Amino acid sequence: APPGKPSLGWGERTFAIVEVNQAATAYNQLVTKRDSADVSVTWNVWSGDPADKARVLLNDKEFWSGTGGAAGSASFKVKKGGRYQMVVELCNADGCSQSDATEIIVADTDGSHLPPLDYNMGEKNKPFKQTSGKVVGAYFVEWGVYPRKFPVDRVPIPNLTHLLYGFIPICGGDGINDSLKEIEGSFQALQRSCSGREDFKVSIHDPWAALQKPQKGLSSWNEPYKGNFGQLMMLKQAKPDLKILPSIGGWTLADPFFFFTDETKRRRFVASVKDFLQTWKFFDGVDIDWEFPGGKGANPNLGSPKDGEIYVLLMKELREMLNELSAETGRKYELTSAISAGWDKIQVVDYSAAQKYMDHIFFMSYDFKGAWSNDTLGHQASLYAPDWNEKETYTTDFGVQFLLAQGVSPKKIVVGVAMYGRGWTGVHGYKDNNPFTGNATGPVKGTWQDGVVDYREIATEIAQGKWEYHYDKVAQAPYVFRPATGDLITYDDARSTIEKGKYVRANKLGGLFAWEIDADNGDILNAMNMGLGNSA
Numbered sequence: 001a002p003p004g005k006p007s008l009g010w011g012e013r014t015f016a017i018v019e020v021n022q023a024a025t026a027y028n029q030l031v032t033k034r035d036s037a038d039v040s041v042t043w044n045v046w047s048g049d050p051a052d053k054a055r056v057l058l059n060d061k062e063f064w065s066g067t068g069g070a071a072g073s074a075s076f077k078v079k080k081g082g083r084y085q086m087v088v089e090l091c092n093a094d095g096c097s098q099s100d101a102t103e104i105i106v107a108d109t110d111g112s113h114l115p116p117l118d119y120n121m122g123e124k125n126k127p128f129k130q131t132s133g134k135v136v137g138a139y140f141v142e143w144g145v146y147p148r149k150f151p152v153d154r155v156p157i158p159n160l161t162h163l164l165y166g167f168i169p170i171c172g173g174d175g176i177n178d179s180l181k182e183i184e185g186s187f188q189a190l191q192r193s194c195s196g197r198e199d200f201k202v203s204i205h206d207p208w209a210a211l212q213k214p215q216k217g218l219s220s221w222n223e224p225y226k227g228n229f230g231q232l233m234m235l236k237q238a239k240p241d242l243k244i245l246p247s248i249g250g251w252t253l254a255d256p257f258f259f260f261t262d263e264t265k266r267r268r269f270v271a272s273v274k275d276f277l278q279t280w281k282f283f284d285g286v287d288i289d290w291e292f293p294g295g296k297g298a299n300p301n302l303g304s305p306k307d308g309e310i311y312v313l314l315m316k317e318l319r320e321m322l323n324e325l326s327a328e329t330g331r332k333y334e335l336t337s338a339i340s341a342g343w344d345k346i347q348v349v350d351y352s353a354a355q356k357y358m359d360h361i362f363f364m365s366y367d368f369k370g371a372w373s374n375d376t377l378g379h380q381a382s383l384y385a386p387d388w389n390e391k392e393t394y395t396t397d398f399g400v401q402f403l404l405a406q407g408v409s410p411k412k413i414v415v416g417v418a419m420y421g422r423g424w425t426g427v428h429g430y431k432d433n434n435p436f437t438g439n440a441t442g443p444v445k446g447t448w449q450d451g452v453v454d455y456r457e458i459a460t461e462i463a464q465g466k467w468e469y470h471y472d473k474v475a476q477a478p479y480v481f482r483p484a485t486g487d488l489i490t491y492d493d494a495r496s497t498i499e500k501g502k503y504v505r506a507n508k509l510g511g512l513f514a515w516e517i518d519a520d521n522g523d524i525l526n527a528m529n530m531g532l533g534n535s536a
């Protein structure tokens with residue numbers, strides 16, 4: 001005659017290892033990284049021996065032992081998230097009794113409590129299989145969920161191996177992150193998020209988009225993690241082998257890096273990064289987009305020859321930080337970086353020395369030519385130099401060789417692909433029907449900001465005959481031209497992306513990567529894995 005069947009009393013059945021204040025605007029008030037979740041039960045058997053023994057069972061393995069007996073309560077620690085079956089067991093001299101199981105959710109940024117992401121392969125995306133063994137990466141921007149309507153559930157995930165999340169900002173006010181003042185509302189936004197937080201620690205530029213904004217699958221009022229991070233958690237559960245990296249910096253956010261000559265700040269940075277990774281477990285390492293060591297970035301008042309040395313010390317300590325994290329986590333972390341393809345910026349850093357600590361070098365072989373000049377027109381992301389300009393040194397090919405010349409091993413170089421277009425308007429005074437010899441009166445009409453056009457748009461407008469398509473066979477780069485208004489646009493397409501693929505394969509490079517994922521209709525990513533020799 002075992003004791004009576006226990007009846008649990010209702011308490012909340014959702015707990016969080018990492019807690020998120022779904023109503024905060026600062027980062028310190030937003031997230032609490034805890035080491036374990038506190039789970040509490042309350043049960044009751046009417047008229048029972050209170051000296052009976054009692055156990056709480058999560059998925060039929062024991063988590064708590066006591067007496068309880070009749071009308072009892074138990075609290076305990078759980079260190080790994082998931083969806084559990086909770087049972088309270090009573091025990092006397094004859095046998096045991098169990099209660100009807102109830103499901104609880106221990107949430108963790110692991111994604112353990114979540115189902116796999118439900119993704120979309122819309123548009124011209126065809127499913128591939130990562131048989132190449134080569135890197136196929138793409139950038140996902142944080143702000144892409146507002147007027148772009150590109151949530152994480154729209155990423156064609158079977159066609160990537162790595163995924164870069166842009167961007168992770170670094171705390172700091174006046175002087176430290178002045179580059180954000182160029183973009184409306186951004187500086188004020190970071191300052192809100194970094195309020196009460198020491199400068200030179202990592203944070204989140206937009207807490208709403210990252211963790212609070214309701215997207216597909218995460219609409220509930222009681223979802224601990226939502227937004228982009230929420231869906232990124234659902235992604236590691238769809239494709240566990242898909243590397244998801246956080247990108248720190250970028251063009252308008254790289255300003256604080258120039259202060260890392262200071263031992264004190266660089267150690268505080270690396271520290272906050274370590275916690276950042278423990279706080280957000282779906283990440284698989286660190287990506288550093290310092291633009292650029294030495295200068296020539298957004299801020300004209302920042303830069304130093306000594307920057308090249310601090311770049312090599314930052315990666316040495318970041319690697320060590322990840323090493324002693326692998327120790328504790330038992331996991332592997334990738335350390336990567338997006339560097340310039342300009343030889344004048346490559347010079348500053350000894351990448352042959354930095355490569356010891358790194359895995360992947362995202363060679364930004366794009367943005368060579370743009371609307372920031374009226375009379376220097378050219379190819380933005382061409383492979384080689386054009387016929388009319390043989391001594392062009394800002395090409396994909398030249399930069400790679402220049403980087404290889406340092407002593408960098410080719411397996412670590414990941415060539416960049418442009419999923420967008422840089423353009424001009426009012427091109428005039430050109431010769432031989434070659435618009436690049438002409439000059440422009442301004443930037444072309446842009447998709448979001450003028451001077452930049454999404455490939456999605458370009459491809460559509462070509463099929464409507466609103467453009468003239470030309471392909472430079474020598475430089476391996478397409479462009480479109482409208483003789484009337486004098487509009488000229490540089491970009492990458494299917495053809496040139498394949499040739500970047502052949503180049504990587506022939507020269508035994510690392511693979512390809514694209515900026516940005518939402519500017520594609522599926523044609524360039526397809527060219528990316530056909531060119532790298534993937535399977536369909």
Ligand SMILES: *[C@@H]1O[C@H](CO)[C@@H](O)[C@H](O)[C@H]1NC(C)=O
Binds near residue numbers: 442
């Ligand atoms: C291009 O030309 C227009 C008018 O000639 C001028 O307003 C603009 O500042 C120029 N842009 C650059 C980058 O020189």
Ligand SMILES: *[C@@H]1O[C@H](CO)[C@@H](O)[C@H](O)[C@H]1NC(C)=O
Binds near residue numbers: 430438
């Ligand atoms: C374009 O601008 C440059 C500026 O130095 C000038 O030398 C050149 O003649 C211009 N080309 C035309 C076709 O006006």
